[PDB]
């Protein structure tokens, strides 16, 4: 079963390809409608794989140097193996001398495709956390922010280093624990600083005066955080507070850059409002003028966007080059400036959390998921990931889309046509979790092979190497397109195609390219008589691709208006990171129905599903909503009224960005969220127009 095949390969190898059978000819590779791509999850969890505590074997060939995998052809008699990528034949290392047939190494077994090694590079560096704190917000927001930061300090490892930077009009770098005096270094939030300047002005396991071990400092930090008071500078009438977000971030970047470069470090920035002074300024300090909107940027009425975006974009590359992670936690009623700061958590593996106030269950709980631990009391996060992909000589890599930065490594696996962050065989992911998913786009220039090698720093400090080796059948020449049409992953393709459209919109029509491929895929793999729209059918392999495209082209990922720019950049941020299942939920929210007549059942995203005597539960990945029809909007009636509330709580915990919960009913203002995701104007109309063009000229 092809579905059993897709399921078991994602559970084992954390990957889902657009095609599981690849064009064996040049004549079909060029004519691929949906590019050969893969939804690769480098750190996916699974049923407790054995950590291989020995260094992986490698191929003895300067260029190739792939990892010993089940595809390799072994010879237990001569103690030799032949690399599957370059046919080079290797000798077994001395630790493999007692190799035997009835007891062979772990990597070789087809079950241990996708396996992790633990290597020792000497002393493991301590983890580094750098709190960057805004002080320009209300007291109830600042007091809640302080409690959350004190709670995160109780979870950090005793080995880890911590640093505190608060700001407002000025920027304060705190020198931790200097006993009875409490000092800090004051910098103007009006002019930027480079790392070398910041190094001169400021000055067994290592630690600075500004970055000290948790076990030795946690009591002074938990007190300083408890005494943090709002920015002492007054805010006159009709004015915004002077907030130097752009310089505070750059000082946090330059501090770690000159102290601990090239090591796992997390810059956690907390924002209560937009940057109002300095490089990276997002809006002026006059309350008369509002923060820019999508309408304002389209009519060239937003003089801070490009200059501010460029500032944080250079900061993003500075930190991503050094190998440091930039988190952004923004909670305010107005906009924050996420559009100008989006590149910092996008290029690195940084998080992006957005809410109305730090004094809510929404932010408080979301902030403590960041420090969730596994079956060993260790954070589910990795640092400084290096992703390298080995391909067969027939495959080339166009590029990647997702949280990564190009290491600009050249090799025969690089393709001329580059996509996203392309032109490289190696990418750096400064931060990753068991959820991070990159979209890798391949190109063909019989059993192909792709090997993913991910080196990262673990929460324990251990250096680990994740090696996943997949293999997909080459198409048979006498059955080329028929097998290709059978190995189609309609879900994986819809998101991989969505990845391309969104990346082009965020780096600017996009719907036109999205339709010309929808029509092309309908003509090559659909069934129809020419000039007869009613004859068009699709295989069960393809039937859902049109509907996924309908919702994608109408979603808030591409129709940015009726949303704020920060909301748009926040939606795109999480969609470029999630695996397949969650990404489907975003584009096409799931909808359950609750009534006396039957247990909960999923129903269509159509206006016909909104019944008066029924309770709905829509799962947008960003919000969980419960709807009560006009009838139910009033023990048996209780089982119904709390059946969605019960099912909500479960998923209301797993998901990292805790979805905003909503309880509304017919006539309520919050029912608008259901009516906008529900229901060209209609599918029916969208499908008909698609069929008229599908049976028409190609």
């Amino acid at each position: 079963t092809y579905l059993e095949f897709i399921q078991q390969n994602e559970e084992r190898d954390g990957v889902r390809f657009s095609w599981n059978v690849w064009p064996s000819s040049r004549l079909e590779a060029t004519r691929m409608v949906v590019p050969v791509a893969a939804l690769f999850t480098p750190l996916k969890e699974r049923p407790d794989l054995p950590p291989i505590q020995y260094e992986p074997v490698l191929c003895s060939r300067t260029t190739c140097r792939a990892v010993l995998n089940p595809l390799c052809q072994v010879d237990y008699r001569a103690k030799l193996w032949a690399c599957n990528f370059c046919y080079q034949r290797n000798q077994f290392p001395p630790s493999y001398a007692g190799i035997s047939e009835l007891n062979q190494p772990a990597e070789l077994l087809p079950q241990f495709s996708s396996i992790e090694y633990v290597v020792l590079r000497g002393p493991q560096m301590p983890l580094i956390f750098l709190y960057v704190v805004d002080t320009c917000m209300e007291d109830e927001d600042l007091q809640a922010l302080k409690e959350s930061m004190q709670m995160s300090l109780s979870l950090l490892p005793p080995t880890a280093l911590v640093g505190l930077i608060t700001f407002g009009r000025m920027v304060q770098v705190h020198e931790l624990g200097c006993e009875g005096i409490s000092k800090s270094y004051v910098f103007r939030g009006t002019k930027d600083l480079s790392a070398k300047q910041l190094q001169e002005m400021l000055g067994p396991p290592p630690s600075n005066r500004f970055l000290q071990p948790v076990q030795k400092i946690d009591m002074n930090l938990t007190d300083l955080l408890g005494e943090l008071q709002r920015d002492p500078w007054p805010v006159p009438q009709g004015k915004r507070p002077l907030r130097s977000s752009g310089v505070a971030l750059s000082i946090a970047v330059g501090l770690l850059e000159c102290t601990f470069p090239n090591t796992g470090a997390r810059i956690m920035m907390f924002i209560g409002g937009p940057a109002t002074q300095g490089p990276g300024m997002v809006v002026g300090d006059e309350l008369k003028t509002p923060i820019r909107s999508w309408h304002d940027i389209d009519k060239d009425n937003a003089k801070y966007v490009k200059k501010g975006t460029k500032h944080f974009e250079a900061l993003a590359n500075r930190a991503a080059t050094t190998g440091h992670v930039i988190d952004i936690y923004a909670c305010a009623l107005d906009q924050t400036g996420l559009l100008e700061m989006k590149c910092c958590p996008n290029l690195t593996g940084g998080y992006m959390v957005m809410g109305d106030s730090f004094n809510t269950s929404l932010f408080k709980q979301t902030f403590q998921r960041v420090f969730t631990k596994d079956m060993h009391g260790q954070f589910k996060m990795g640092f400084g990931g290096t992703l390298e992909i080995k391909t067969s000589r027939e495959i080339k890599i166009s590029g990647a889309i997702g949280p990564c930065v190009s290491l600009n490594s050249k090799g025969p696996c690089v393709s001329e046509n580059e996509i996203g962050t392309g032109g490289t065989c190696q990418w750096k992911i400064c931060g990753l979790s068991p959820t991070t998913t990159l979209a890798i786009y391949f190109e063909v220039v019989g059993r192909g092979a792709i090997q993913f090698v991910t080196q990262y720093q673990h929460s324990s400090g251990q250096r680990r190497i994740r090696v996943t080796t997949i293999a997909r059948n080459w198409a048979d020449a006498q059955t080329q397109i028929q097998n290709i049409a059978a190995s189609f992953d309609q879900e994986a393709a819809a998101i991989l195609m969505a990845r391309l459209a969104i990346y082009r919109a965020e780096t600017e029509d996009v719907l036109r390219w999205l339709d010309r491929q929808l029509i092309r895929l309908c003509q090559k793999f659909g069934e129809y008589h020419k000039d007869d729209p009613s004859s068009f059918r699709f295989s069960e392999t393809f039937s859902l691709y049109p509907q996924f495209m309908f919702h994608l082209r109408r979603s808030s990922f591409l129709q940015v208006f009726n949303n704020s720019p920060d909301e748009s950049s926040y939606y795109r941020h999480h969609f470029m990171r999630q695996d397949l299942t969650q990404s489907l939920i975003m584009i096409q929210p799931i909808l359950y129905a609750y009534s006396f007549s039957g247990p909960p059942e999923p129903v269509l995203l159509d206006s016909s599903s909104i019944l008066a005597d029924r309770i709905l539960l829509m799962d947008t990945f960003f919000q969980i909503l419960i709807y009560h029809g006009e009838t139910i909007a009033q023990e048996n009636f209780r089982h119904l009224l709390q059946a969605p509330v019960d099912d909500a709580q479960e998923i209301l915990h797993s998901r990292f960005p805790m979805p905003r919960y909503i309880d509304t009913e017919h006539g309520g203002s919050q029912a608008r969220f259901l009516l906008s995701k529900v229901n060209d104007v209609s599918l029916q109309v969208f499908m008909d127009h698609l069929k008229k063009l599908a049976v028409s000229s190609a």
């Binding site: 209300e138 709002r230 007054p234 805010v235 006159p236 009438q237 009709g238 004015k239 507070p241």
Partner: protein, 137 residues
């Protein structure tokens, strides 16, 4: 939305208490003393004056004038509430000694309450007549 605050005895214009911080003061201080000289027992008890980008606000109680200057953009609603807080505190503490003193600024130590009250109005987070001043002068 700034500062200049003076308290003076209406009769002779004798200064009683003031408060000024710069980091000009020289011009609007004269105008403030010109007004204290013109004010008599027929002057309006509550008035507001316009001086271009600046605006004076004063009240008069028990022969004592409470003058404040600020940028015109400062709320005139808040300017009089600031003077009222000063009057009730000043009259309660020194209202019966005013018609007896003769030294200038015999209540400099009222500097303290002026500035701690002044900050409760020049911070949005903390939460009648009109005539051009060039006329009365």
């Amino acid at each position: 939305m700034v500062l200049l605050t003076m308290i003076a005895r209406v009769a002779d214009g004798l200064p009683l208490a003031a408060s000024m911080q710069e980091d000009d003061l020289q011009q609007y201080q004269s105008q403030a003393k010109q007004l204290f000289r013109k004010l008599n027992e027929q002057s309006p008890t509550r008035c507001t004056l316009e001086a271009g980008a600046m605006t004076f606000h004063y009240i008069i109680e028990q022969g004592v004038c409470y003058l404040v200057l600020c940028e015109a953009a400062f709320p005139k609603k808040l300017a009089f509430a600031y003077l009222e807080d000063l009057h009730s505190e000043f009259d309660e503490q020194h209202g019966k000694k005013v018609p007896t003193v003769s030294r200038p600024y015999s209540f400099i130590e009222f500097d303290t309450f002026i500035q701690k009250t002044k900050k409760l109005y020049i911070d949005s987070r903390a939460r009648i007549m009109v005539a051009n001043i060039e006329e009365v002068l």
